[PDB]
């Protein structure tokens, strides 16, 4: 179990790695990754790639259901990481350093379609880099010297850790950005990001707080009212707020440097750029939010004098329904005891924790 | 905006910080933080603590909705970072280095209650550290040397950043563990974690993969079968699994180090411990998805092969056939892979809904419709990309002996464009590369005008 990292000399994290671990130098993370975000070391599948192994369109998850979210392939779904051709260093970090057979690295074809599911046809199946593992265990971290071919723009690198003591390999796609040194929009610099941070209800709004020389300045503020249920989808209001900022402001722009270079709102995470020489430093996002009391997703736990768990009972009650609860202790011991009571809502967020006391 | 960090000398990351950034050494993270996991720099609330400010129970969230989850307070809810008495470096990391009034640090009372919401009464309200900010901008990352009071066990430090140029303060509570010398289970080590990674269905199972001297060894494996709606909750099966692991194994135990150094299953993350000299060095988690899954599918009708660029933005008039309970996402891209339209549609089984997508740009060439399909719980099931084109408006067949009465249509003149001139004769727009002169005309710059301009001889030629 391991993953592609960049803690030492690694020139770019892997897609799954980024679902959990911010990037080296930009703090960026990938979004809505499913369970794999808890366990980026678990992208494990049948070996024998490319002749066999993970079927087309399941290369990025290695057919592990845990990582199914990774199999989506579009021009703007994924955090991309910059790279140059020639000799680069790729890094693996292991939580379990299995006897290793070899590591292999493939890069997408130069003219691949970033909006098709990743498939054998997407890749130059003659790997650009192969490292002998020699049927020994590796250290708990290694790096590799690979001759990254010449590409332009968005490309994917597939890193295949083929372990020796199992019939599985670890597959980490890497989302890279081949920028040929010539800086794109050098009078624009990133200053903040619109993460798809949560869904909003109708009557909420979301707005910018633009921080410059005289702290925040509301002349630069942009606000988007949420007036349909569809716009309340995180990825919908993110895109609409980016679009609105671009329309209403001129000293800052929102979106990704697309294939056209010039900033364009995407339907995921929209970075915010700041015109250089404009004095702006940073942009944040803020939000205006406009027994069975209401609709509640509830929880409960029993504790004692020594602050220890005994029992648990959820109950995502309806409105007004006064339901009965049987909880039993897993240690009916005497003395100081506590009963926590969590009153969330039917969307998760915490409203009220009320602790009682009792003695057995 | 900023947060308590440990990218350098920092002794400990703040609770919210750990919702997004894995801990300095252990690579640990808090779980189920809600929206704040995307923006830990934003735990912002009314200033004036403790006389006024964020009310009791809302201290750790600073009353900010985005960070409501933080207000939960139990003995085992949060990652606890280790700390010593005496001088320590507390480190803030800023995204907006605001003019600063002061920083203050409060520690909980030595005998506070970790199962009561955090409250003024939980703290020594005489701050154990104060740093006068001087009403100047800090650098983007700073550290304060603070004389941490002597304590023992689970303690919460509240780091209050009081901002100079607003009515707000950033509140970052910090969960710490005072264990100095006095080794806690030195014959036991952490080797992995049961993170509550996902909900599971009935028929699924979840099991361990223990890695030691000879690779993985299934004699230590424990498997939990999800046989109940309740056990499918990510917190529940994490607890039940750690409990089963402890029943059946002896060289490894799962759960948080409690108050008595006893490894005990909790209801969030359950760490996994490995007995000294047993050989075991790492435990992972794995899942069998043997819950029966409906044969999901989506079908998109109404996509044309070609769409003629009209006056208004091009529109897709599609309808969707949904098999299984699904959530859909569709995105239109153009042949240079820029995004122009999207349609989220949380459908249900057999439902047939109308989609109408509008291209932010109606320009000619090859376009793709990306159709992404997930189930009621948002697991990606399949992606299909359908192709279509945009064609320019087909110019009608020619007729008569010219194309425009000059200057009409001036913008479109190209090699072969015949026009009727004011003198009554017909001229044609010269070929490459004179053809660009034909587009150059104005009532002030009247050259290149057929039969009138000083230099029409270049751009145009008379027809016979």
Domains of chain B: 2-178 (2.70.50.50), 188-288 (3.30.70.2150), 297-391 (2.60.40.2550)
Option in A41, A197, A307 nearest B39 (CB): A197
Which among A230, A287, A309 has the least Cβ separation from residue B76? A309
Evaluate whether A61 touches A71 at the Cβ level (below 8 Å).
Answer: yes
- A24 in contact with B at a CB cutoff of 8 Å? no
Q: Is A289's CB within 8 Å of B65's CB?
A: yes
Q: What is the CA radius of gyration of chain A?
A: 25
Minimal Cα–Cα distance from B37 to chain A, Å?
8
List the structure tokens of B237: 């099966």
Residue in B closest to A356 by C-alpha? B116
Helix (H, G, I), strand (E, B) or coil at A70: helix
State this model's resolution in angstroms.
2.3
Give the integer Cα–Cα distance in Å for A226 and A223.
10
Query: What are the residue ranges of helices labelled H in chain A?
Result: 15-20, 234-248
Residue with tokens 């030492």: A8
- CA–CA separation, B282 vs B189, rounded Å? 10
Interchain proximity A21–B20, CB inside 8 Å:
no
Across the interface, which of B117, B215, B370 has its CB nearest the CB of A165?
Answer: B215
Q: Do B71 and A353 touch (CB under 8 A)?
A: yes
Chain A residues close to B42, C-beta within 8 Å: 284-286
Q: Residue B111: how many CA atoms within 13 Å on its side-chain side? A: 1
* Rounded (10°) CA dihedral B82, B185, A3, A180: 30
The CA distance from A187 to the nearest CA of chain B, in Å, is: 20
Method: X-ray
Long-range contacts of B225-229, Cβ-Cβ distance < 8 Å, separation of 24 or more: B226/B200, B226/B201, B226/B202, B226/B291, B227/B202, B228/B202, B229/B202
- CB of B166 within 8 Å of a chain A CB? The answer is yes
Tell me how close the Cα of B454 comes to any Cα of chain A, in angstroms: 41
Instruction: Please state whether beta strands B418-420 and B306-308 pair in parallel, antiparallel, or not at all (unpaired).
Output: unpaired
Residue A122: is the preceding peptide bond cis (ω within 30°)? no
Residue of A nearest to B369 (CA): A115
Closest partner residue to A287 (CB to CB) among B66, B265, B282 is B66
Q: Is A95 on the interface with B (CB under 8 A)?
A: yes
Which residues in chain B have Cβ-Cβ distances shorter than 8 Å to A306? 258-260
CB B103 within 8 A of CB B159: yes
The answer to whether A209 and A227 are in contact (CB under 8 A) is no
Chain A residues closer than 8 Å to B379 by CB: 34, 65, 68-69
Chain A residues 292-351 within an 8 A CB cutoff of chain B: 301, 303, 306-309, 312, 314, 338, 340, 342, 348-351
φ, ψ for residue A218, nearest 5 deg: -80, -5
Q: Closest residue of A to B374, CA-based?
A: A69
With H, G, I as helix, E, B as strand and everything else as coil, classify residue A219.
helix
Choose among B10, B386, B280, B331: nearest CA to B172: B10
Contacts of A216 in chain B (CB under 8 A): 165-166
From the list B233, B365, B226, the residue with the least C-alpha distance to B306 is: B365
Contact between B422 and B443 under an 8 Å Cβ cutoff? The reply is no
Do the bridges between strand A81-83 and strand A129-132 make them parallel or antiparallel, or are there none, so unpaired? unpaired
Question: Which chain B residues touch A258 with a CB distance below 8 Å?
Answer: 337-339
Residues of chain B with Cβ-Cβ distance to A230 below 8 Å are 344
Three-state DSSP class for B203? coil
């Amino acid at each position: 179990h391991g993953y592609v990292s960049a803690y030492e000399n690694g020139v770019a994290e892997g897609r799954a790695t980024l679902c959990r671990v911010p990037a080296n130098d930009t703090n960026e993370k990938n979004t809505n990754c499913g369970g794999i975000e808890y366990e980026p070391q678990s992208v494990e599948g049948p070996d024998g790639f490319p002749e066999t192994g993970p079927r087309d369109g399941k290369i990025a998850s290695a057919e592990n259901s845990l990582a199914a979210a990774l199999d989506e392939q579009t021009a703007d779904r994924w955090v991309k990481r910059p790279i140059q051709s020639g000799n680069q260093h790729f890094e693996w970090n292991f939580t379990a350093n299995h006897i290793t057979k070899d590591w292999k690295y493939y890069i997408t074809k130069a003219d691949w379609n970033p909006n098709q599911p990743l498939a054998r046809d997407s890749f130059d199946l003659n790997p650009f880099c192969v490292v002998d593992g020699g049927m020994v265990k590796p250290p708990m971290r290694v790096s590799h010297l690979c001759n990254v071919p010449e590409r332009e723009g968005y490309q994917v690198i597939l890193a295949v850790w083929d372990v020796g003591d199992t019939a599985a390999s670890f597959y980490n796609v890497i989302d890279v950005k081949f920028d040929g040194d010539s800086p794109v929009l050098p009078d624009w610099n990133q200053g903040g990001q619109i993460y798809p941070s949560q869904d909003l209800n109708v009557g909420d709004s979301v707005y910018t707080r633009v921080f410059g020389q005289n702290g925040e300045n509301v002349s630069y503020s942009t606000e988007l009212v949420i007036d349909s249920e569809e716009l309340g989808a995180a990825n919908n209001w993110s895109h609409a707020l980016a679009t609105k900022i671009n329309q209403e402001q001129t000293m800052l722009q929102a979106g990704q440097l697309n294939a056209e270079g010039v900033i364009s709102p995407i339907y995921g995470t929209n970075p915010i750029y700041l015109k250089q020489g404009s004095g702006l430093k940073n942009v944040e996002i803020d939000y205006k939010i406009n027994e069975a009391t209401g609709d509640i997703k509830t929880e409960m736990t029993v504790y004692n004098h020594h602050h220890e768990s005994l029992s648990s009972h959820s109950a995502e009650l309806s409105d007004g329904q006064v339901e009965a609860a049987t909880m039993t202790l897993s240690k009916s011991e005497p003395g100081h005891h506590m009963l926590v009571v969590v009153v969330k809502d039917q969307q998760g967020k915490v409203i009220e924790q009320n602790t009682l006391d009792f003695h057995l």
